[PDB]
Write an enzyme that holds these catalytic residues in place. Structure first.
Site, PDB file in Angstrom:
ATOM      1  N   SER A 137      -8.491  -5.023  -2.533  1.00 46.21           N
ATOM      2  CA  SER A 137      -7.614  -4.396  -3.528  1.00 46.21           C
ATOM      3  C   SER A 137      -7.495  -5.092  -4.895  1.00 46.21           C
ATOM      4  CB  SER A 137      -6.221  -4.172  -2.932  1.00 46.21           C
ATOM      5  OG  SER A 137      -6.113  -2.852  -2.439  1.00 46.21           O
TER       6      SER A 137
ATOM      7  N   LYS B 228      -8.483  -3.332  -8.113  1.00 44.72           N
ATOM      8  CA  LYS B 228      -7.570  -2.456  -8.841  1.00 44.72           C
ATOM      9  C   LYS B 228      -6.957  -3.143 -10.059  1.00 44.72           C
ATOM     10  CE  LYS B 228      -6.363   0.402  -4.822  1.00 44.72           C
ATOM     11  NZ  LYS B 228      -7.301  -0.327  -3.896  1.00 44.72           N
TER      12      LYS B 228
ATOM     13  N   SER C 214      -1.096   0.157  -5.092  1.00 39.77           N
ATOM     14  CA  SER C 214      -2.535   0.088  -4.849  1.00 39.77           C
ATOM     15  C   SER C 214      -3.024   1.382  -4.180  1.00 39.77           C
ATOM     16  CB  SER C 214      -2.897  -1.173  -4.060  1.00 39.77           C
ATOM     17  OG  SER C 214      -2.697  -2.319  -4.887  1.00 39.77           O
TER      18      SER C 214
END
Length: 352
Positions: free
Chosen positions: A41, A44, A107
């Protein structure tokens, strides 16, 4: 010996980490900081950076409405299975403000696709932008393949590079960065909490940035906190356990604030030194720096810092251009130069 002690770094139960000062860029501690790893993640964070740069350039506003297309349809693409999602559906019209909170706080993967198409026309074009910033930021160990970090076998980054992306978010797109401390947002009547648990930690002033986990990647966290105007960024990748999710980073940040402080000995345009100039419309050149100087030094030592300078050439001869480098400023602690910065001409000196 206590005045010049170099503190021991605490043990960190993670494969890789780095701790840097946001203003000076100083690396306070690091371990395997350049090793290529799955960002999960953390990807992102770059997605957010691109969106922020687009907004900063006025390409779209927070109140602008985005129409959800088929590719951002959460339950229309099993690639999203088991992942964080806003449950966007085609035909939905959602303000950028909600989508970017979906990305930043939550996220949300479907939200990444929705903004990618909106900002750049296609996912591929958006990834192109991500990698273009990877290059502009000079990251040597990062590459992206998707706008969300899912389904990207060949993506990678590192602790150092993720901290530097963190630094760039804070520096270049502050309006985007300011969204990261929001603890919750609400979408389709459902309250969503910021997944960055450190925000609730009361002993620190944490305001970002992104936490992530894959069985592949282990625990990943890029965090940033302030004490006054002092700001540190930590990046910890491949965290080994659930329990140290936040704790390992907290050790680094607090250690950083306990042993180091950042000082700003000189600002742009302020005269640091004066030297004779030949052939000019003035008899002397005003010398300093073209970028505020921030230094990271052992906490307590600010009154011991000394500064001096050397000149590259015997004589200064006009014409002298603004910000022309003519030497080096030496910052010293205990007879040892600890930092160097370019010495430059503060006002152009044309020929007489």
């Amino acid at each position: 010996n206590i005045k010049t002690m170099i503190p021991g770094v605490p043990q960190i139960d993670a494969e890789s980490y780095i701790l840097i000062d946001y203003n000076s860029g100083k690396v306070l501690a690091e371990q395997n900081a350049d090793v290529r790893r799955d960002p999960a993640s953390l990807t992102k964070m770059m997605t957010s950076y691109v969106i922020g740069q687009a907004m900063k350039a006025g390409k779209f506003k927070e109140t602008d409405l985005v129409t959800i297309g088929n590719d951002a349809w959460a339950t229309g693409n099993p690639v999203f299975k088991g992942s964080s999602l806003m449950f966007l559906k085609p035909g939905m019209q959602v303000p950028v403000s909600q989508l970017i909170r979906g990305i930043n706080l939550q996220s949300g993967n479907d939200a990444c696709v929705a903004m990618a198409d909106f900002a750049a026309g296609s996912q591929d074009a958006f990834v192109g932008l991500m990698n273009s910033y990877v290059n502009a930021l000079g990251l040597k160990n990062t590459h992206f393949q998707t706008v969300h970090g899912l389904d990207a076998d060949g993506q990678y980054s590192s602790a150092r590079d993720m901290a530097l992306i963190g630094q760039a978010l804070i520096r270049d797109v502050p309006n985007e960065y300011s969204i990261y401390k929001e603890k919750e947002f609400t979408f389709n009547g459902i309250r969503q909490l910021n997944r960055n648990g450190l925000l609730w930690d009361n002993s620190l002033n944490v305001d970002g940035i992104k936490t992530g986990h894959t069985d592949k990647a282990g625990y990943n966290l890029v965090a940033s906190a302030t004490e006054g105007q002092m700001r540190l960024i930590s990046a910890v990748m491949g965290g080994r356990t659930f329990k140290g999710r936040e704790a390992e980073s907290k050790k680094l940040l607090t250690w950083g604030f306990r042993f180091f402080e950042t000082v700003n000995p000189l600002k742009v345009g302020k005269e640091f030194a004066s030297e004779p100039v030949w052939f000019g419309d003035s008899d002397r050149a005003s010398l300093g720096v073209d970028k505020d100087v921030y230094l990271t030094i052992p906490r307590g030592r600010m009154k011991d810092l000394k500064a001096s300078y050397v000149l590259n050439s015997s004589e200064l001869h006009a014409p002298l251009q603004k910000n022309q480098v003519v030497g080096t400023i030496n910052f010293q602690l205990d007879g040892k130069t600890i930092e160097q910065r370019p010495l430059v001409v503060l006002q152009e000196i044309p020929e007489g």
